[PDB]
């Protein structure tokens, strides 16, 4: 079979990829790149009023995750946007106008979740692009299911994308994996071709 | 021996694990999961009064690591809680009531420490669980030694744990690796089974 050198090379390549945002596709929805969440429509952040900050003993305020964590890379357990119930929206102005060719959703891995279950994960969802103004009914680009038994990061390629470019897209979460009280969104990424 | 495919698979599995908090066990002491440090008893943070922040030239304040870094994942050099001398405590309300089956301690790796030594690492330590209120003398669950010549992350399994659950545990550091002035704690994790 293979040689000690071959192995090294395979491993170098694997770690190279690993270090390129795991999956090696640019992310036009990454916040630090110039992307942002511009609206959650009527999505009500599920506030637990649980994380009390307090100085010298005096209660200052409760922390909760901004819906903008969804465009940030820290994906430790609890670093997700939670909203009430199994349905919710996020409108993201991508850092650039692109032809969207794919998206990535990821969730905390099972082995780091209590009981190896992740009922708060999104399930069925869809992606709408908007040609300018977000208040239009937007154009649907794809509908997919986050697979609770799949890998934590999963990438969904659109079927025969038009060559229509967009800079505003909406992550519309339609179902969850059964958690009765909220859905928690860890990270959402948007890949595609920049205009020319 | 092995095939090019076998190798890929091994590497995929290794990186899968790598990405599941390195060791693939949930962490009931991770802060973002809902855990917190609730007391350092009489542990005096070793304040160096060294990290001066300052705007337009005017001294605002000295930074020092909160004892709460111990429940945060950023483990670059200097991201540790320091306390005076070789003895110190941290009481952690875990994010959940569990039967504690193991803990993890880790420290900055040698190769990133000056002179490849880490005298400020903890050495002998122990874990006490509290059945409700932390002010009791607590029940000892285990006593271990962080091995300065071992790997940076090390996991200690308790010997014949009772099936007693707890939500408050205490990291009690008994010795260090010889640094005459402080001990620096990078990250402390607590693993176990959630109640049912």
């Amino acid at each position: 079979g293979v040689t000690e050198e071959q192995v090294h090379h395979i491993v170098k390549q694997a770690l190279q990829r690993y270090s390129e945002d795991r999956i090696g596709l640019a992310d036009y929805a990454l916040e630090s790149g110039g992307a942002s969440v511009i609206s959650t429509r009527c999505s009500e952040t599920y506030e637990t009023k649980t994380a009390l900050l307090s100085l010298f003993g005096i209660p200052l305020w409760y922390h909760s995750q901004s819906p903008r964590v969804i465009l940030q890379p820290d994906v430790h357990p609890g670093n997700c946007w939670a909203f009430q119930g199994p349905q919710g929206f996020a409108v993201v102005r991508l850092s650039a106008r692109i032809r969207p060719t794919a998206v990535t959703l990821e969730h905390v891995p099972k082995a780091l979740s209590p009981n190896s279950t992740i009922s708060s994960a999104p399930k069925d969802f869809a992606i709408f692009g908007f040609d300018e103004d977000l208040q239009q009914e937007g154009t649907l680009l794809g509908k997919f299911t986050y697979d609770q038994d799949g890998e934590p990061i999963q990438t969904f390629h659109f079927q025969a994308p038009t060559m229509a470019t967009y800079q505003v897209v909406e992550l519309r979460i339609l179902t969850n994996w059964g958690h009765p009280e909220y859905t928690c969104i860890y990270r959402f990424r948007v890949h595609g071709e920049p205009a020319h | 021996g092995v095939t090019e495919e076998q190798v890929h698979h091994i590497v995929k599995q290794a990186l899968q694990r790598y990405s599941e908090d390195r060791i693939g066990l949930a962490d009931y002491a991770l802060e973002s999961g809902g855990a917190s440090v609730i007391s350092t008893r009489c542990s005096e943070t070793y304040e160096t009064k060294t990290a001066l922040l300052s705007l337009f030239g005017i001294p605002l304040w000295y930074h020092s690591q909160s004892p709460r870094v111990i429940l945060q994942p950023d483990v670059h050099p200097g991201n540790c809680w320091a306390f005076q001398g070789p003895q110190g405590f941290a009481v952690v309300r875990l994010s959940a009531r569990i039967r504690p089956t193991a803990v993890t301690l880790e420290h900055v790796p040698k190769a990133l420490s000056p002179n490849s030594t880490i005298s400020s690492a903890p050495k002998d330590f122990a874990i006490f669980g509290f059945d409700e209120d932390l002010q009791q003398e607590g029940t000892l669950l285990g006593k271990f030694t962080y091995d300065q010549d071992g790997e940076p992350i090390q996991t200690f399994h308790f010997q014949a744990p009772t099936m007693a659950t707890y939500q408050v545990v205490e990291l009690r550091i008994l010795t260090n690796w010889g640094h005459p002035e402080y001990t620096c704690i990078y990250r402390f994790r607590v693993h176990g089974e959630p109640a049912h």
Partner: peptide, 24 residues
């Protein structure tokens, strides 16, 4: 270590989960 708690008596913000877990 008697009834001590220096974290509680400092310039350091303290964080604690008064309800259950945060969402995750």
């Amino acid at each position: 270590c008697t009834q001590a708690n220096n974290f509680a008596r400092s310039f350091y913000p303290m964080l604690r989960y008064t309800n259950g877990p945060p969402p995750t």
